[PDB]
């Protein structure tokens, strides 16, 4: 039960911190990777 | 490898 | 019966049924864009408040509805396709359904042109060079001999962005669903 | 921590790919009309964007009726629905043993993830007339009444029909608790892997059921599959097909398996909810047409396999309740019609005093003496014929029509065998003690012995035979037939014990 | 002719296919491709933009909206000949006995009209099967629709095993079994018992029973039309083979269940109790196809389920209307202990007339029915007070009728494992003499258990001598 | 935050609200404005575009078509906490005892998920409720669902008031009463009884029972959400306080019937007898939330009306499926004069097991049920012929059976107005001893009139002695 | 004339007048037919209003003009109704002159809550 509740606390804080950071992260390499992915699906399509 | 490496980094910071 | 000419998109329902009949007739007599522009002119007409108030109201005695629409047709000189179409919609009383049959037949003709209704969500106000390269790779991505008609919408909730729906095929690199896939991975 | 890190970041591929979707119309009450999936195949697992599966049925030209696997708050109008790409499937292994598994594959009991290896399609086609062979093995339940009047075959389906609160789940758990002594033994042919599919029950009944099985040390045959009341109607619908697919895995590998479908009428009523929400026309008692086809697939997934196909068997026993004993209702007539074996509990014998409350002549096993041991066949056929004679003579001589010596003989032997067939809850006995005690009941030696004293006769007789007659019971159960020296020895031991009983 | 179409809507059997070039007429066969097996569709109604509403026979797990079907001009065609004897086929026409294909020359179409009034035969000759309660109380007809009703667990399958044994071995011609929604192990025991008894020969062409078997877990198009497959095979053995042929359809209530399931899904209003409105018409077609004609003689024994012993269900009532000599298999006389728990007080016969069978047989049959019907009201007189006040003669006829009712039981040879007794064969004249000798007052002193499980009257004499001394 | 949409169609509860930009998810609480009292609607089905099909909880009168509706964006958040003890509320969360608003700190939502299989209590302590028929034949489970079936005028409410006035004194755990679709007269009498009995306290913060009332005057949307209200109050007192709560829900057929009324308006196809297709799963979720868990204990006594005395009706049938101790408070045994008219044969309990309740209690209970089943067969024979057709064994069974069947009846404390006797609280060992003596047959000389409305067996001996002395 | 406050009977059938328009109507409202009759507007739909009549359907044609009253279903009330046979809507049918009611009590309000009640 110790490792269970510490695991739950850990996983929820990880998800909350991910929301906190990536909600305020824009540097257009997201969109660059996404257009690269459309390009890759174009080459394989 | 965009998002999950940032999640790795935050796994380090919680660790 | 007669061989009903197959439309490219099966729009279903009542208005899709009227529209498939009208499409098969206009493709037998091969005046499809003429009938489309005439139905657009009709849909411009029947949004006038006097005509639509006369038509949507009951106790205007259906014979007088048929007479009024035949006189409106004989005033602006429609083709013999949409004349009998408006007369049939008047006789059956589904003049409530005529902007929806115009929308359905417009959809069927827009697929007859070859357009693909592309949806993109960048989840942020994107710029013009991104839109140019995206339209370039997406026009290359869809098919040969078809033209895309893309729309973009935004919302700050879904982080990251770039979901693209092209012709039922839905590619999804949104940061929110990446966290959702890692979320199903992490809970196990 | 670090292992959790690396399994999270390596396990999910995040391999994005172009994929068929479609937006959602009316999301009514677990049903969702989905517009767009023009290449979806019928009855396919599909996936709502909030992370929840649904099953696509009722493919119509307008839209597809996907019925959801769970809660309905998490779905709006206008969200995507991604095709998974395959029919709904159940992860099956032998590492799934002894673990409560929520109806798809999802082990909701707090003991880690399932170590499955063999995924299996759940809507598979049952074997034909050539891969099947007939019942041969004696599926014993430990109940004296079942194993002596309605015996089960490894290779067979046999109902437990009654009314509510009669002992049907208790008969199923007697059947489960008997087979421990065959699992921990030597022969693989004796060993048991059973699947208890609890449909539509409450979670605390399944929890106390797992408590009884763990306290009785049952968790190596057993696989408990709970689709409880709070689960959605397709989880209750699809759960016995999952247990059937796990049983088919064990059967086609060649291990003797069984499935207890507890409260199979709850599958029928969940599928009634599904059809009436997907707007199919209602048939009788508002159940649709193909409820018989539903249970017919589910119950003809089981018979003995051919000797060239591994030799594994399946024993389907579904538990069904009537209401006010009305056998003529739609679901009991359908499920009696598909099955062949059926155990009838009427309940007035439960309040009258026999336990388990098989009220009897309605109950029949069509495989009969073929699914008994040779000893029980040599002993307990005249018992069934005598009980038939006893029932009809008591039925017309309720008031004392004519009492010669023959009629009081019939009522004496009938009442004494009636108190033989009483048996306490959660106490199954092996076949050799059953042969011994029905030998002490049918072959004389109990006919004039005061019918209230039969239960103490049972207790002291089992104490005697387990006290200094273990090797003779080994001779009976391993030799098969009860031999003539063992026959006269049982005669001598029951005579000696009649003396020690009138001592 | 082979016109292609598009599956557009899939619910079980009920599958809507859109044709726009060539429209197949009603009751046809569509081959759905795209499956690794074949899928067949029985075409029915054409609703518009041409739309056939078909019923699909195999499971429709995995049919895409917009699939390509092929259209052939077949109602549904099956391989039919002398080659299809020792082999089990199902309704599409394909062998499910794992013995390669069926190499035949001519096929046959499953759907035809019932022939004509001018071809109906008129002769009525008694068929004796060796069963006591059949041979005197409801005799059979060589060329007549024999039907045996019953609930579940009353003994229809053991009775149909006894008829298959005792008649299909006593038959120089051919036989056709039709397992219409019978459970798979009982049909498997039938196939293995047929092989081991030698009526199916796995080495050459010396077989004389043709098996058509549709399992009970198939979609309703495959569980209704499989009876019609058995009809088609046994029609060919009657139409242009020129042979006395007998057909055993067990169990035509899956036919009506299948019709009620598709009629729930096809879009038809439910009738009385919940079956289709086309019950009497559809079963009239498939029970008037199966009758003896002037070209050939065909006799059809039909194992016919009733739900939970309810004879006023409309499908058993209309089935009564189609038969010639039924046999009720009650349960209450097996709660007594007589097997099968045959009601002759509810059984019929077209064959039982004083000119057809005789005056002796007819008078002893009506005497047995008269003394068993009187025993019911007399037993209800007993049920309040007992055996004290009836009369001398009233108690005498109660004991005589009870002795007759115990004498109606007969050990089947195929059921030597349920009771253990070996089982005997009883001719007709012996049954007449035995019941006439019990009515004649010869055996008023022997106990009721001396007549219980016997064959002739000599077996009752031997069992009475065994019980006494 | 909220989204303003438009009412376009109105039937009762079922109000089709048009949302074009801000359509809310299913099971939401969205308020109609322009009203005297807040008209909280509950979003279900989105049917077309825009179309949330809401169920409306209050006075549907005055709902103009095209009327503005503010969507709040949550399920029905109600006050919970220790500030709700001794304080009445209805399904929105509103206090309807005119004392002021709830001064609690946190809100809990009306709609929640059941506790999972991972954590479920499997222990069964016997709840002895001082009633002879209960503690003998279907004894209650301290931590399990208890159900009081029965028709109209069979004594369900009187048996609930006995259960409060007997068990609710014992549990220091905060009790919760939920009245769903019952008389407002009974809720009024219960509220003043809780004031006078000291169970609630209007001058201090040390009251013991919370009250929720969604009585039968309410429109069907309201009555379909009262059990959820009182249940999430009692589910707060289980989870985030750790108490051993009692949950007295009368009368859960009103919940199911309000569901059937709404669903007949909701356009779903009618199921069997006249109910909805979602009878198994709506009641399934609502009953699976009523459960004893690792975090705390619920002992939930719930009264379950049966329509026209049909136990084969779908709602009582599924409620037999969802329970741990049934009690079939029949009517025909009250035609015979026995109150409560608890059919004890059709009443069972899961806890009756010789490895739990002991061998003595089990043997006495099964002997009592055996004698009464033999009496039912013999009363068929008696009703036709008469008692002069029975043997000595049969007549001793009939006499012992009538003695037992009268001795099951006792007078309660709350039903002292109807009868004359005071409230008898019978302990457990006296129930076992009394029925064991009557079953063993030491009382083959007392009349059967001496066992009627008695209590302990010494009161039966004293009533027979006083009967003989007043005949002396 | 005006589809906001008046409306026309589309189809009076068995017990229901489906009236067209009538946009200013509110649910459960006494709306009166120009045949002198009354009804109550039950289920509001985006095309029509289902008003159930308070009399026979024989007096009502199709397209008979329907007019709102403006208030929920009421009945006249008071001590001035004492001594008197009234109809279900409040009209005196005993023939001895009209009623002198001043108040107007709504026909469908809720029962009191558990606090304003006190026991018998
Ligand atoms: N052999 C037995 N001896 C004593 N009691 C039994 C026996 N078999 C069943 N019971 C009783 O049956 C009850 C359980 O019934 P159950 O199988 O749960 O029926 P259902 O599943 O329909 O509720 C228990 O209360 C138990 O006392
Ligand atoms: N001649 C017979 N002797 C003994 N038992 C019989 C006989 N005929 C039938 N039975 C009984 O009938 C049962 C088989 O029933 P079956 O025929 O399979 O059901 P159905 O009648 O529904 O097809 C067996 O239990 C068997 O004991
Ligand atoms: N112990 C009792 N003694 C006498 N009468 C009782 C007893 N219990 C119940 N009753 C009778 O039952 C009635 C109460 O039934 P109640 O439960 O209020 O009906 P409902 O089930 O509709 O709520 C009372 O009128 C009372 O006469
Ligand atoms: Mg059960």
Let me know if chains B and C touch, i.e. at least 3 Cβ pairs under 8 angstroms: yes
- Helix, strand, coil % (nearest 5) of chain B? 85, 0, 15
Mutational test site, ligand 3, from F156, F157, F158, F190, max ligand atoms within 8 Å of CB:
F158
Alpha-carbon distance of F132 to E237, in angstroms, equals 76
Picking from D54, D69, D86, the residue at the C-terminal end of a domain is D86
* 3 state DSSP class of F452: coil
Q: Are D230 and D206 in contact (CB under 8 A)?
A: no
Neighbours of chain B (3+ CB pairs under 8 A): A, C, D
Q: Are F209 and F85 in contact (CB under 8 A)?
A: yes
**Is residue D9 in a domain?**
no
D286 and D366 part of one domain: yes
Give the burial class of E426: count Cβ atoms within 10 A of its Cβ; 0-12 exposed, 13-18 middle, 19 or more buried: buried
Q: Residues for chain E: how many in total?
A: 469
Distances (CA, A) of C98 to C81, C82, D189, F113: 15, 12, 73, 46
* Whether B2 and A14 lie within 8 Å, measured CB to CB: no
E222 and E285 part of one domain: yes
Q: Are F229 and F281 in contact (CB under 8 A)?
A: no
* Whether B4 and D5 lie within 8 Å, measured CB to CB: no
Give the burial class of D283: count Cβ atoms within 10 A of its Cβ; 0-12 exposed, 13-18 middle, 19 or more buried: buried
Residue D173 Cα to ligand 1 middle (Å): 10
Alpha-carbon distance of F339 to F333, in angstroms, equals 8
E306 and E440 part of one domain: no
Query: Of C148, A15, E9, E317, nearest to D40 (Cα)?
Result: E9
Give the total number of structural domains in chain D.
3
Strand D314-321 relative to strand D257-262, pairing: parallel
Answer whether D208 contacts ligand 1 (Cβ < 6 A): no
Strand F244-250 relative to strand F175-180, pairing: parallel
Alpha-carbon distance of C46 to C97, in angstroms, equals 11
Cβ–Cβ contact B2 with C under 8 A = yes
Alpha-carbon distance of G23 to D257, in angstroms, equals 67
E463 and E366 part of one domain: yes
Give the total number of structural domains in chain E.
3
Cβ–Cβ contact D12 with C under 8 A = yes
Q: Find tokens 């081959």 and name the residue.
A: E31
Angle between helices E428-439 and E392-407 (to 10 degrees): 160
C-alpha E127: how far from chain center: 16
Residue F300 Cα to ligand 3 middle (Å): 21
F375 and F245 part of one domain: no
Contacts of F56 (CB under 8 A, 6+ apart): F10, F12, F13, F14, F15, F32, F39, F41, F42, F63, F219, F221
Structure tokens given for F236: 């707060």
Which residues share a beta bridge with E410?
none
Q: Are D361 and E153 in contact (CB under 8 A)?
A: no
F235 and F93 part of one domain: yes
Looking from the CA of residue E160, the nearest atom of ligand 2 is 17
Alpha-carbon distance of E105 to D112, in angstroms, equals 62
* Whether B14 and A17 lie within 8 Å, measured CB to CB: yes
List strand residue ranges (DSSP E) for chain C, in order. 115-121, 147-153, 163-166, 169-172
Picking from F351, F380, F401, the residue at the C-terminal end of a domain is F351
F43 and F85 part of one domain: no
Helices (H), E146-296: 156-168, 184-197, 220-239, 254-266, 279-288
Maximum CA extent, chain C: 71
Alpha-carbon distance of G3 to E459, in angstroms, equals 96
F105 is known as an active-site residue: no
Dihedral pair phi/psi, residue E457, rounded to 5°: -75, -20
Residues E364-374: b if buried by 16+ CB within 10 A, e if exposed: bbebbeebbee
Q: Are F88 and F96 in contact (CB under 8 A)?
A: yes
Contacts of C23 (CB under 8 A, 6+ apart): C5, C7, C32, C105, C108, C109
Picking from E351, E372, E395, the residue at the C-terminal end of a domain is E351
Specify the residue with its C-alpha closest to ligand 3, atom 24. F155
**Is residue D6 in a domain?**
no
F338 and F450 part of one domain: no
E178 and E306 part of one domain: yes
Q: Find tokens 């017309």 and name the residue.
A: D396
Query: Of C50, C55, C59, nearest to C69 (Cα)?
Result: C55
List strand residue ranges (DSSP E) for F255-295, in order. none
> DSSP per residue over D309-336, as a string?
TTT--EEEEEEEE-STT-TTSHHHHHHH
Strand G6-12 relative to strand G65-72, pairing: antiparallel
F169 and F252 part of one domain: yes
Provide the 8-state DSSP code for C58: S
F113 and F236 part of one domain: yes
Provide the 8-state DSSP code for E293: B
Q: Are E452 and E439 in contact (CB under 8 A)?
A: no
Of the bound ligands, which one is closest to the alpha carbon of residue F190?
3
Dihedral pair phi/psi, residue G31, rounded to 5°: -120, 135
List strand residue ranges (DSSP E) for E38-189, in order. 39-44, 51-56, 67-71, 77-79, 88-90, 94-95, 107-109, 126-127, 140-141, 145-150, 174-182
Residues 50-89 in F contacting D (C-alpha not used; CB under 8 Å)? 51, 75
Residue F451 zone, left/alpha/beta (φ > 0; ψ -120 to 50; rest): alpha
Looking from the CA of residue E250, the nearest atom of ligand 2 is 23
Q: What angle do CA F219, F222, F225 make, to 5 degrees?
A: 150
Provide the 8-state DSSP code for F27: S
Cβ–Cβ contact C178 with B under 8 A = yes
Structure tokens given for D246: 């796990």
Structure tokens given for B9: 């980094």
* Whether C57 and G3 lie within 8 Å, measured CB to CB: yes
Chain G partners within 8 Å of C57 (Cβ): 3
Cβ–Cβ contact D129 with A under 8 A = no
D364 and D217 part of one domain: yes
Neighbours of D365 (CB within 10 A): 23
Q: Are C77 and C130 in contact (CB under 8 A)?
A: no
Alpha-carbon distance of D127 to E184, in angstroms, equals 9
Alpha-carbon distance of F410 to G49, in angstroms, equals 58
Q: Are F10 and G42 in contact (CB under 8 A)?
A: no
Specify the residue with its C-alpha closest to ligand 2, atom 25. D366
Structure tokens given for F55: 């169920």
Distances (CA, A) of F53 to D318, E170, F6, F22, F76: 39, 71, 12, 14, 16
Residues E246-258: b if buried by 16+ CB within 10 A, e if exposed: bbbbbbbbbbbbb
D122 and D43 part of one domain: no
Q: Are G38 and G30 in contact (CB under 8 A)?
A: yes
* 3 state DSSP class of D82: strand
Residue F355 Cα to ligand 1 middle (Å): 14
Specify the residue with its C-alpha closest to ligand 1, atom 14. D167
Cβ–Cβ contact C137 with B under 8 A = no
Residue of D nearest to F75 (CA): D73
Residue D480 zone, left/alpha/beta (φ > 0; ψ -120 to 50; rest): left
CA of C58 vs chain G CAs: smallest distance (Å): 8
* Whether F278 and D273 lie within 8 Å, measured CB to CB: yes
F144 and F282 part of one domain: yes
Mutate to test the interface with B, among C158, C159, C178, C184 (most CBs of B within 10 A): C178
Residue of C nearest to A16 (CA): C179
Picking from F60, F75, F90, the residue at the C-terminal end of a domain is F75
Residues E329-339: b if buried by 16+ CB within 10 A, e if exposed: bbbebbbbbbb
* Whether A10 and B14 lie within 8 Å, measured CB to CB: yes
Structure tokens given for C53: 């108030």
CA of G94 vs chain F CAs: smallest distance (Å): 32
D42 and D92 part of one domain: no
**Is residue D7 in a domain?**
no
Q: In which domain, by residue range, is D21 found? A: 17-86
Residue F459 Cα to ligand 3 middle (Å): 23
Query: Of D125, D97, D28, D112, nearest to D67 (Cα)?
Result: D28
Q: Are D151 and D372 in contact (CB under 8 A)?
A: yes
Structure tokens given for D61: 């030209």
Contacts of E449 (CB under 8 A, 6+ apart): E406, E463, E467
List strand residue ranges (DSSP E) for D59-117, in order. 64-68, 81-83, 89-92
Chain F partners within 8 Å of G28 (Cβ): 60-62
Alpha-carbon distance of C95 to C68, in angstroms, equals 13
Alpha-carbon distance of D230 to D232, in angstroms, equals 6
D171 and D242 part of one domain: yes
D43 and D154 part of one domain: no
Specify the residue with its C-alpha closest to ligand 2, atom 18. E157
Structure tokens given for E271: 């009738």
Structure tokens given for D4: 């959790």
Structure tokens given for G17: 């007048």
C-alpha E74: how far from chain center: 27
Q: In which domain, by residue range, is E417 found? A: 352-469
Alpha-carbon distance of D158 to D155, in angstroms, equals 10
* 3 state DSSP class of E452: coil
H or E, element range at D195:
strand D193-199
H or E, element range at E180:
strand E174-182
Picking from D325, D341, D372, the residue at the C-terminal end of a domain is D372
Structure tokens given for F314: 């779908």
The torsion of the CA quartet E355, E358, E359, E365, rounded to 10 degrees, works out to: -120
Angle between helices F156-167 and F184-196 (to 10 degrees): 20
Chain B partners within 8 Å of D8 (Cβ): 7, 11
> Do you find a cis peptide bond into C91, omega within 30 degrees of 0?
no
Resolution, angstroms, 1 dp = 3.5
Chain C partners within 8 Å of E18 (Cβ): none
F80 and F58 part of one domain: no
The order of strands in the sheet holding E342-343 is E94-95, E88-90, E209-215, E174-182, E245-250, E298-305, E145-150, E325-329, E342-343
List strand residue ranges (DSSP E) for F36-118, in order. 39-44, 51-56, 67-71, 76-79, 88-90, 94-95, 107-110
Neighbours of C21 (CB within 10 A): 18
């Amino acid at each position: 039960m110790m490792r269970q509740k510490e695991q739950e606390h850990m996983i929820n804080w990880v998800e909350k911190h991910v929301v906190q950071s990536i909600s305020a992260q824009q540097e257009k390499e997201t969109i660059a990777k996404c257009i690269a992915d459309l390009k890759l699906l174009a080459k394989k399509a | 490898q965009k998002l999950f490496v940032d999640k790795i980094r935050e796994y380090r910071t919680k660790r | 019966f007669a061989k009903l000419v197959r439309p490219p998109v099966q729009i279903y329902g009542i208005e899709g049924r009227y529209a498939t009949a009208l499409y098969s007739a206009a493709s037998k007599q091969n005046k499809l864009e003429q009938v489309e522009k005439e139905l657009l002119r009709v849909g411009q007409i029947l949004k006038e408040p006097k005509m639509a108030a006369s038509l949507m109201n009951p106790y205007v005695k259906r014979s007088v509805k048929v007479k009024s629409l035949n006189d409106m047709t004989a005033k602006e000189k429609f083709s013999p396709l949409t004349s009998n179409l408006i007369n049939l919609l008047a006789e059956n009383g589904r003049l409530n359904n005529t902007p929806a049959v115009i929308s359905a037949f417009s959809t069927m003709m827009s697929v007859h042109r070859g357009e693909v209704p592309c949806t993109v969500t960048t989840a942020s106000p994107l710029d013009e060079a991104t839109l140019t390269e995206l339209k370039t790779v997406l026009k290359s991505f869809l098919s040969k001999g078809q033209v895309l008609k893309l729309e973009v919408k935004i919302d700050p909730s879904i982080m990251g962005g770039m979901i693209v729906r092209i012709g039922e095929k839905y590619v999804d690199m949104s940061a929110k669903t990446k966290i959702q896939k890692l979320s199903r991975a992490m809970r196990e | 921590v670090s292992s959790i890190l690396e399994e999270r970041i390596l396990g999910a591929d995040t391999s994005v790919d172009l994929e068929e979707t479609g937006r959602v119309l009316s999301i009514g009450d677990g049903i969702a009309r989905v517009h767009g999936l023009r290449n979806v195949q019928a009855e396919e697992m599909v996936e709502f964007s909030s992370g929840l599966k649904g099953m696509s049925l009722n493919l119509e030209p307008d839209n597809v009726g996907v019925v959801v696997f769970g809660n309905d708050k998490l779905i709006k109008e206008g969200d995507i629905v991604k095709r998974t790409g395959a029919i709904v499937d159940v992860p099956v292994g032998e590492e799934l043993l002894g673990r409560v598994v929520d109806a798809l594959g999802n082990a909701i009991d707090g003991k880690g993830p399932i170590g499955s290896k063999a995924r299996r399609r759940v809507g598979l086609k049952a074997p034909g007339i050539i891969p099947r062979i007939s019942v041969r093995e004696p599926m014993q339940t430990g109940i004296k009444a079942v194993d002596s009047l309605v015996p089960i075959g490894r290779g067979q389906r046999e109902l437990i029909i009654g009314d509510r609160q009669t002992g049907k789940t208790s008969i199923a758990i007697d059947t489960i608790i008997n087979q421990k002594r065959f699992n921990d033994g030597t022969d693989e042919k004796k060993k048991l892997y059973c699947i208890y599919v609890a449909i539509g029950q409450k979670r605390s009944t399944v929890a106390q059921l797992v408590k009884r099985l763990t306290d009785a040390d049952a968790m190596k045959y057993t696989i408990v599959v709970s689709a409880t009341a709070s689960d959605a109607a397709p989880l209750q619908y699809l759960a016995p097909y999952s247990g059937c697919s796990m049983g088919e895995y064990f059967r086609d590998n060649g291990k003797h398996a069984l499935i207890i479908y507890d409260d199979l009428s709850k599958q029928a009523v969940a599928y009634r909810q599904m059809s009436l929400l997907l707007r199919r026309p209602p048939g009788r008692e508002a159940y649709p047409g193909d409820v018989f086809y539903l249970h017919s697939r589910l119950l003809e997934r089981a018979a003995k396999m051919n000797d060239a196909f591994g030799g594994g068997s399946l024993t389907a026993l579904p538990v069904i309740e009537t209401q006010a004993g009305d056998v003529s209702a739609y679901i009991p007539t359908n499920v009696i019609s598909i099955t062949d074996g059926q155990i009838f509990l009427e309940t007035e014998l439960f309040y009258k005093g026999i336990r388990p409350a098989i009220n009897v002549g309605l109950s029949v096993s069509r495989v009969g003496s073929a699914a008994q041991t040779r000893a029980m066949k040599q002993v307990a056929g005249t018992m069934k014929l005598e009980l038939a004679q006893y029932r009809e003579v008591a039925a017309f001589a309720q008031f004392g029509s004519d009492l010669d010596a023959a009629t009081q003989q019939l009522l004496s032997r009938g009442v004494r065998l009636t108190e033989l067939l009483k048996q306490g809850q959660y106490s199954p006995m092996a076949i050799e003690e059953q042969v011994a005690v029905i030998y002490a009941g049918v072959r004389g030696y109990l006919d004039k012995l005061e019918p209230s004293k039969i239960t103490k006769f049972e207790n002291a007789f089992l104490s005697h035979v387990i006290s200094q007659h273990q090797t003779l019971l080994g001779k009976i159960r391993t030799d098969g037939k009860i031999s003539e020296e063992a026959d006269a020895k049982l005669k001598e031991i029951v005579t000696n014990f009649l003396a020690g009983f009138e001592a | 002719g082979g016109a292609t179409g598009r599956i557009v809507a899939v619910i079980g059997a009920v599958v809507d296919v859109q044709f726009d070039e060539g429209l197949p007429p009603i009751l046809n066969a569509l081959e759905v491709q795209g499956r690794e097996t074949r899928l067949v569709l029985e075409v029915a109604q054409h609703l518009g933009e041409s739309t056939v509403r078909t019923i699909a026979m195999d499971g429709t797990e995995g049919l895409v909206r917009g699939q390509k079907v092929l259209d052939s001009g077949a109602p549904i065609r099956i391989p039919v000949g002398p080659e299809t004897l020792g082999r089990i086929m199902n309704v599409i026409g394909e062998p499910i006995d794992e013995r390669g294909p069926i190499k035949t020359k001519q096929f046959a179409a499953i759907h035809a009209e019932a022939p004509e009034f001018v071809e109906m035969s008129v002769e009525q000759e008694i068929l004796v099967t060796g069963i006591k309660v059949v041979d005197l109380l409801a005799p059979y007809a060589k060329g007549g629709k024999i039907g045996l009703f019953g609930g579940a667990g009353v003994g229809k399958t053991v009775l149909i095993m006894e008829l298959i044994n005792n008649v299909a071995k006593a038959h120089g011609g051919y036989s056709v079994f039709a397992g219409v929604g019978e459970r798979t192990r009982e049909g498997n025991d039938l196939y293995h018992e047929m092989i081991e008894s030698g009526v199916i020969n796995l080495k050459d062409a010396t077989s004389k029973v043709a098996l058509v078997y549709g399992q009970m877990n198939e979609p309703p198009g495959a569980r209704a039309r499989v009876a019609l497959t058995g009809l088609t095979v046994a029609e060919y053995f009657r139409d242009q083979e020129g042979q006395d042929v007998l057909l055993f359809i067990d169990n035509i209530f899956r036919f009506t269940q299948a019709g009620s399931e598709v009629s729930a899904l096809l879009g038809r209003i439910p009738s009385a109790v919940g079956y289709q409105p086309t019950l009497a018409t559809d079963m009239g077609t498939m029970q008037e196809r199966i009758t003896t004609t002037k070209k050939g003689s065909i006799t059809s024994v039909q194992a016919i389920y009733v739900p939970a012993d309810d004879l006023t269900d409309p499908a058993p009532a209309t089935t009564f209307a189609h038969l010639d000599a039924t046999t009720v298999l009650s349960r209450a006389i097996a709660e007594l202990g007589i097997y099968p728990a045959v009601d002759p007080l509810d059984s019929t016969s077209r064959i039982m007339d004083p000119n057809i069978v005789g005056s002796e047989h007819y008078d002893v049959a009506r005497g047995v029915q008269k003394i068993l019907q009187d025993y019911k009201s007399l037993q209800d007189i007993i049920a309040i007070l007992g055996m004290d006040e009836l009369s001398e003669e009233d108690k005498l006829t109660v004991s005589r009728a009870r002795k007759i009712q115990r004498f109606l039981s007969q050990p089947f040879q195929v059921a030597e494992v349920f009771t253990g007794h070996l089982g005997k064969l009883v001719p007709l004249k012996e049954t007449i003499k035995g019941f006439q000798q019990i009515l004649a007052g010869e055996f008023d002193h022997l106990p009721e258990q001396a007549f219980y499980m016997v064959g002739p009257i000599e077996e009752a004499v031997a069992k009475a001598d065994k019980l006494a001394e």
